[PDB]
Amino acid sequence: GLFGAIAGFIENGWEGLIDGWYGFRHQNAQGEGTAADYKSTQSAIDQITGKLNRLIEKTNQQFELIDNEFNEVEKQIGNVINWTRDSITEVWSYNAELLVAMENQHTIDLADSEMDKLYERVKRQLRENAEEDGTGCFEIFHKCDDDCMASIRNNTYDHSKYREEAMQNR
């Protein structure tokens, strides 16, 4: 996409993840554990449903009948009518195809965007206590357990407490 997070440096997604859209997956001394992040999920979801709300609704404008199916109208005015209706039908087909194509492009780039926003959030929680993997992982240096991880995923993580160790272990 435009942000190179989804189908970018993050190699792929996690079919095992069914809790939300984006999440964390950690492997520390106390074994592997993975769970989803709610704020980003609800952001992207509320935006996509915003698009649907703007689309899924109908006009109140009412159109009458100008021709006849059983008893064909006069030939000239009928050819003018069919010419007008064909031109309009053509226009609405173009408008529809363009609309859907651009709403899809924007949707994809928006989910990509929310991913980059979560990664760049954590990257700023772990100021100097971690190093950039390159595949969307964060190589911590201090001994972060299954409770310090849950302090990351709540943003309650204090980097000054665990700064000494991770700094020295550079």
Binding site: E64, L65, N68, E69, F70
Partner: protein, 53 residues
């Protein structure tokens, strides 16, 4: 012959404005009206070959 008849009777119509006067003069061959019609309000009109529901 159309329904076994060769005659024809063809119909014409005009909308008379409120507080207006229509006036016929005729020499014959005239299918005269007995009842003017008025519109009741608003409606839709469709053409179909399926049942109501």
């Amino acid at each position: 012959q159309v329904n076994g008849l060769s005659g024809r009777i063809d119909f014409h119509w005009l909308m008379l404005n409120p507080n207006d006067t229509v006036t016929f003069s005729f020499n014959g061959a005239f299918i005269a009206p007995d009842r003017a019609s008025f519109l009741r309000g608003k409606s839709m009109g469709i053409q179909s070959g399926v049942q109501v529901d």
